[PDB]
DNA sequence: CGTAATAC
DNA sequence: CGTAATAC
């Protein structure tokens, strides 16, 4: 039998003792419209997060279903979609409260053409949600992905100097061997090449950022956020951890918990939730 | 019962009496690789044409199956595919003999980015194969299609001044009501809008070119070259004539026949064959 | 390899 | 609405 993973209960109190005051939820919906048909929005209303980040929406701004506009609580909504590619990439950020400033992309024309980054600045921190480019089957985009990784790292380092940073989304890499079920087989596959894993480790050390889930559960294995639709991967928990909450070190005393909502359906990714005490 | 169409026998002698010396075949394969799996190449070897034009190949140059390189007779092969779009558009031209000159596109940067035109110049005439942009569901590209139509018309008029011209391929318009099964329903659908039909009539008169099939069969109805995969259109012969051989008037004394190979499978389009006596 | 999405 | 093709 396959070894399954049960995410531990929500810890809503920081180590300092302060109660959690902010609840961010991130989910790669892999088809915003199909995700809504599969009752994804119902799960969101059940989670009731202060902020909701979505990746791989595959939805142009004009094609957004009407129910999203009428969603309760998360009234302030921002979307980014590729200029010239239909049904590809795309992210979104939905918040209960209005952000002070909202910008798009990372400032480099080469990397801002697929709608992968939304930046939402708040009084106490800056939230970035990202959908990092996949290296592709055959590694056709691995050279581009290394260029992106370097540009994205410099971008986040500049943001982090002025304000504490929270980064979330599909970062499209399993950092370590614990972060995917079959590491020996995937050393040359997109998501686990040495170039991608190194860029991730360089990102954590340069900005600097910490992997919230791994920080709290350093030896917890079999904890994935993605399973291919093929070969019953999700039934057999043959997965990858591609979806992260990376925090600035100064927010670590405010970190309460980082969750993996393994049971939530509607995508080949599952949602992840962050609890902070600000 | 639906009214079916039987293409009359091949007339291989021109009205002047000269025997046919050139046999051009054009086919919108709508998926070059799927077309080869469906034994499309076998049909080509059975037709044995001097020149073979293909449209909507949906195949990048590096992904072309190996059997195409080893095809007998049609050894000189030229392909055009979109720069930035995978599995979209694309044409090809295969000839028994080497052409004097082979160029790509129509010379306008805006219209040469999807690989829709190949021009093959020969001693006695210039052959153009085209895959004209579809106006799209909802007519999103109808404004662009009118701009293309004007640029393409001027391009062909310049070619025709120096040499007699033969144009073939999917021109993505049913000229007249006879050219599609349900004209009253499609007046606002891509392929039969007033803008597309007028651009086609302006093309015939400006260059000038003649519709070879319609020239030879002025009152022959129910003669289509395309049927949607949906709703058993091909079984019920609910079709469109979108694929043409348009000739310069000076080649009309050399015109022997223009055929519609209704029974040839492998695509939602069927092939068309032209016989000339040069 | 499953699924969602495009284009026609 | 069928089919082929993409991207993951």
Numbering used by the authors:
A (entry chain A), B (entry chain A): 40 to 317
Authors' own words:
Participating in DNA repair and responding to oxidative stresses in the cell, apurinic/apyrimidinic endonuclease 1 (APE1) is a multifunctional enzyme in maintaining genome integrity. APE1 exerts its function in DNA repair through the nuclease domain which possesses both the endonuclease and the 3′–5′ exonuclease activity. As an exonuclease, APE1 digests both matched and mismatched 3′-termini of a duplex DNA with a nick, gap, or recessed (5′-overhang) structures; the matched 3′-end is involved in numerous physiologically important pathways and is more resistant to the enzyme. To reveal the molecular mechanism by which APE1 conducts terminal processing of dsDNA and distinguishes different substrate structures, we determine two crystal structures of mAPE1 complexing dsDNA products, including mAPE1 bound to a blunt-ended dsDNA and to a recessed dsDNA.
